[PDB]
Ligand binder design. Structure first.
Ligand code: PNS
Lengths: 135, 50, 72, 50, 134
DNA sequence: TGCCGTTACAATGTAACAGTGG
DNA sequence: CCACTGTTACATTGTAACGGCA
């Protein structure tokens, strides 16, 4: 375990995720009957200020589909929350044109390294050229 | 050899720049907070040295 | 400009008013910045202009006027 | 009247104590790490200058 | 004008955008009184499946300050919609670590190129170096 | 100007892989 | 083995800022 797990924060995250999914129209409940699903959703809504019971609501009415997406989303949210503290640990999102991305990805799988590592090697070669021009 | 060492020097320079910027930003945010807590909620209530 | 970026750095690194920070305003007595506060001020001045200063020549700087004098 | 005053006192006590606990701890945490980062950066700076 | 604008599509986009914003708590309407805002929002909700009247609804009840954001969101939606048809016109999104991004952007502002142009030039130079050696 | 394309981001969600420990 | 965690590489949508153009 590298990231501290906080219960009262991850529980709130989970509740918000469930509410977002439902309001998006998805069937968070495991119930096919409309009435039981509605009752479970209403109770979940009441659980707004009690994130602790959200775990129990999960164990009682959460759709079996969502375990993987849940554990993925909350894991990623935890990682991002802990990384956002410092800039040097932050991430920057950029968009690339298809030809450029195609060439870059081909180069990276050729070198067997991540995109950031490939960019590091490339920019380092350019900066090495600049340095040798300078010395 | 000296140029090779200067490359490591530049690496260390980038590291130090990273740390200096991090600390500078932390201080800037802290000063902003202090200016925002002129309401006297900071002297002991916020600053529980314990 | 440099002569107002210096004030921007000093005010937001010490939290003092822009009006307070004049050319002759010494950091320790006028602005109240102590050892670490002054260290952070010099570090921020370094960061602003992406330059470096010697330790002794930096510590010699103890006023807004001296700060700009070394910066410009 | 007794009921109302008791509720008010309890609410005030709880709110104040919990708000202070919630805020001051993060404040101290940040202060501590800023101190630590400064300490580290000075060593980096000295080594760089040499 | 590069992309032709289609009403039954862009109007649905606008309705969905406004509904999303309202669900997010944004004040869609210009009415400070809660009753008029709620009435207008209900009209909008029941206004689904209507371009020619959602446009009028916007003209009549829309919050003044969201016009630009909605306009640019629709611009981006249109451009993405037209570009997502072909592979060469699509765009690939990636995440870069902060130091790497800082250096790459440093190069891009220095040279005046965009991220795509800067990376293309750098890769081309790397390829050229390979060819020099090879 | 007012629209319109365009870029460079931000925030969140996912799939997939790699690690880690019991 | 097995589960849970950390990480990367995207996608998806929104936004602000430029710059072109009538
Ligand atoms: P403040 O009273 O806390 O004083 C801080 C300090 C001036 C002692 C500190 O900022 C500092 O300068 N430390 C390093 C001193 C030095 O020159 N060391 C050599 C390089 S490690």
């Amino acid at each position: 375990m590298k990231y501290q797990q906080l219960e009262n924060l991850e529980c709130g995250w989970k509740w918000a995720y469930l509410i977002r999914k439902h309001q998006e129209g998805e069937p968070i409940t495991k119930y096919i009957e409309n009435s039981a699903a509605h009752a479970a959703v209403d109770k979940l809504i009441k659980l707004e200020s009690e994130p602790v019971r959200v775990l129990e609501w999960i164990e009682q009415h959460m759709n079996p589909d969502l375990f993987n997406r849940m554990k993925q989303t909350i894991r990623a949210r935890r990682k991002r929350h802990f990384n956002a503290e410092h800039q040097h640990t932050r991430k920057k999102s950029i968009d690339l044109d298809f030809p450029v991305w195609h060439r870059l990805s081909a180069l990276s799988q050729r070198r067997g390294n991540t995109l950031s590592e490939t960019i590091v090697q490339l920019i380092e070669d350019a900066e090495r050229k600049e340095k040798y021009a300078n010395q | 050899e000296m140029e090779n060492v200067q490359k490591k020097l530049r690496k260390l320079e980038r590291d130090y720049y990273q740390i200096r910027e991090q600390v500078v930003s932390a201080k800037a945010g802290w000063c902003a907070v202090m200016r925002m807590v002129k309401d006297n909620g900071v002297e002991r209530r916020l600053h529980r040295r314990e | 400009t440099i002569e107002e970026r210096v004030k921007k750095i000093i005010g937001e690194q010490l939290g003092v008013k822009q009006e307070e920070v004049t050319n002759n305003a010494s950091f320790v007595e006028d602005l109240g910045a102590d050892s670490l506060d002054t260290v952070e001020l010099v570090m921020a001045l370094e960061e602003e202009f992406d330059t470096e200063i010697p330790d002794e020549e930096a510590e010699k700087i103890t006023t807004v006027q001296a700060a700009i004098d070394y910066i410009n | 009247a007794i009921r109302v005053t008791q509720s008010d006192r309890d609410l005030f006590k709880h709110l104040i104590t919990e708000a202070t606990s919630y805020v001051s701890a993060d404040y101290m945490r940040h202060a501590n790490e800023r101190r630590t980062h400064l300490d580290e950066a000075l060593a980096l700076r000295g080594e760089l200058f040499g």
